[PDB]
Design a protein around this ligand. Structure first.
Ligand code: CNC
Ligand code: NAG
Ligand code: NAG
Ligand code: NAG
Ligand code: NAG
Ligand code: NAG
Ligand code: NAG
Ligand code: NAG
Ligand code: CA
Length: 398
């Protein structure tokens, strides 16, 4: 099923639009995902477009080797949503060729490191999707080999990653269409296995549907909708009410749930009935598209769990974020609560605590929890409440 915001309710999407516009003033956040999101729904924003090109030219000319496969995949997707002058950058910089190498590096890392890629399966799916949409060279056998729904990389602990599953579905679906067309040849029976993979992934995605229509959490729903949009083969009308899901998301937007530009970007296309598969590299660019009218303190139980657990009661100003709690604890005791964070596009990411740093190959990371439940937001955004059992936990992907 495909549902979308009616033209009468377009005003409800304004907070998303506003959020993405403010990201112009944030040099730490990406413009690639934002511009991709906008162009996908037929929206062009000059300032953000200029920001993205600047970021792309910067990374290509002096950091291309360090750019992750998934990051390059998004760059290619953003530059080639439709045919324009900026799309030439893909072929002038040979980004598709570079993506093939980065994608192969992910594969060779899994062979060397017990099945763990350099990044993750979300990016791996982004890689296949981009290579598929832009006629890049990739092995379908490699896809059949690694994208099996039972693969551990679809799961973070015991939790199936809806985001990962959704992006995989979008990628696998592209390969399917490419196979049925004349774009790509493969060993006969590949279409069958990929279809089965997709079938299983759709079931796992729908199994994470909440009572309110959300699929996974608030921030995985948008791309989950995309995946379900293109995979109606594997579910009935009574397996999913798209309208309920849409309505719940719209409610979240009005409550400011999508204040993070990365989250706003990822949710937008589906709300307009669009998916990543609507990317037509051979022209869809409508040049005329877009007319825009324009003290109190609180206390929590903060704990750091590794094997043993260190805990204190911290007091912060009301409306403080999870990160503020961590910083207060660090001041109380740098030995025990001292941490290392890095600035990401999503925001502040916790890499190390007590000199103990998260490791990709070890499949280890720091997990944020409240009352034993994993947060849906980062430390920099999660507003804490009185009497909350806040916890940062050393965890595995399992
Ligand atoms: C892989 C993945 C992803 N993750 Co994590 C999950 N699950 N994540 C991870 C892993 C990262 C390491 C790895 N192997 O890459 C992993 C398992 C450790 C992780 C952890 C976290 N994640 C978290 C969450 C909530 C999110 N994650 C997603 C970004 C969720 C993603 C889904 C999505 N994007 O919609 C996701 C599936 C794909 C990210 C990616 O590669 N994108 C493509 C890439 C090209 O862009 P990128 O921006 O460079 O991606 C990098 C960063 O995003 C960073 N990163 C990953 N997650 C976060 C979360 C935050 C808050 C920040 C600031 C950075 C990150 O890791 C990526 C590789 O370096 C999220 C959209 C999933 C969701 N629907 O809830 C959500 C963001 C929501 C929001 N409004 O903030 C955690 C806070 C969960 C928790 N309760 O502990 C936690 C961060 C704790 C900390 N230390 O600060
Ligand atoms: C498809 O999967 C089946 C069952 O695992 C396997 O026997 C077969 O070799 C696969 N076919 C292709 C072309 O991948
Ligand atoms: C544009 O925004 C202004 C804000 O004052 C509003 O009054 C006006 O009705 C809007 N114009 C339309 C209808 O697009
Ligand atoms: C946790 O304890 C185990 C012993 O059971 C130890 O081997 C391991 O190093 C500890 N974990 C960390 C993160 O050091
Ligand atoms: C706070 O966390 C500690 C462990 O870190 C635990 O012993 C204590 O019971 C917690 N406080 C409450 C009331 O939940
Ligand atoms: C935490 O709790 C203790 C005991 O109730 C209290 O005396 C102290 O003021 C609190 N400390 C902080 C930093 O909140
Ligand atoms: C702090 O502010 C929040 C909303 O801003 C409010 O819900 C909460 O009640 C306030 N502090 C109290 C009374 O615990
Ligand atoms: C921090 O807490 C630990 C554990 O109670 C304590 O032994 C140590 O003296 C403290 N370190 C600092 C830097 O205050
Ligand atoms: Ca330190």
């Amino acid at each position: 099923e495909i549902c979308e915001v009616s033209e009468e309710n377009y005003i409800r999407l304004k907070p998303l639009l506003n959020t993405m516009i403010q990201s112009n003033y944030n040099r730490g956040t990406s413009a690639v995902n934002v511009v991709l999101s906008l162009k996908l729904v037929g929206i062009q924003i000059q300032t953000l477009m200029q920001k993205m090109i600047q970021q792309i030219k910067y990374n290509v000319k002096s950091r291309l080797s360090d750019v992750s496969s998934g990051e390059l995949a998004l760059i290619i997707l953003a530059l080639g949503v439709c045919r324009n002058a900026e799309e030439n950058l893909i072929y002038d910089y040979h980004l598709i060729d570079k993506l093939e190498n980065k994608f192969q590096a992910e594969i060779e890392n899994m062979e060397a490191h017990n099945g763990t890629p350099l990044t993750n399966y979300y990016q791996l799916s982004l890689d296949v999707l981009a290579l598929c949409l832009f006629n890049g060279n990739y092995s379908t056998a490699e896809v059949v080999n690694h994208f099996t729904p039972e693969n551990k990389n679809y799961y973070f602990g015991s939790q199936f990653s809806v985001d990962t599953g959704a992006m995989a579905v979008l990628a696998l679906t592209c390969v399917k269409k490419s196979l049925i067309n004349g774009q790509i040849k493969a060993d006969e029976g590949s279409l069958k296995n990929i279809s089965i993979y997709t079938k299983s992934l759709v079931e796992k995605i729908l199994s994470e549907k909440k009572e309110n229509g959300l699929i996974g959490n608030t921030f995985s729903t948008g791309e989950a909708m995309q995946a379900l949009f293109v995979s109606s083969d594997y579910y009935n009308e009574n397996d999913w009410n798209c309208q309920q899901t849409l309505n719940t998301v719209l409610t979240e937007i009005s409550q400011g749930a999508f204040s993070n530009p990365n989250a706003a970007a990822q949710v937008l296309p589906a709300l307009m009935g669009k998916t990543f598969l609507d990317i037509n590299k051979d022209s869809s660019c409508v040049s005329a598209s877009g007319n825009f009218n324009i003290q109190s303190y609180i206390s929590v139980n903060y704990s750091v769990r590794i094997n043993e657990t260190y805990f204190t009661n911290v007091t912060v100003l009301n409306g403080s974020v999870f990160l503020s709690v961590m910083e207060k604890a660090q001041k109380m005791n740098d030995t025990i609560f001292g941490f290392t964070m890095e600035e990401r596009s999503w925001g502040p990411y916790i890499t190390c605590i007590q000199g103990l740093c998260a490791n990709n190959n070890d499949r280890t990371y720091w997990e944020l929890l409240s009352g034993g439940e994993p947060l849906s937001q980062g430390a920099g955004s999660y507003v804490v409440r009185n009497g909350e059992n806040l916890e940062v936990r050393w965890s595995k992907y399992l």
